[PDB]
User: Fold this.
Amino acid sequence: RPFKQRKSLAIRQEEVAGIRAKFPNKIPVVVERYPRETFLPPLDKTKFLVPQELTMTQFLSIIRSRMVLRATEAFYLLVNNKSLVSMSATMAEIYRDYKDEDGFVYMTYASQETF
Assistant:
């Protein structure tokens, strides 16, 4: 039920190819709730097409705005569910350094997580 389970690699790469053509100024991000989260609500969508200049800090607020319940609680946003990245980085910086082989960049949100 993670996105990478629901769609094959070739299907995901084809989706990014169309996104890159139609939305060339945007960064394609897949944001998913950490599968073990008990507090924060799910979002009402998975794919965000965000400006290149938007910061991680700003993006947090966009993700919060898409939660099905308006929870104000802090949460972490983990790139590949494993990299805590600079919160002043832009979405183009994060895409350049952390995009998946499929062409999306993946982030998981959690209110707590142990590695």
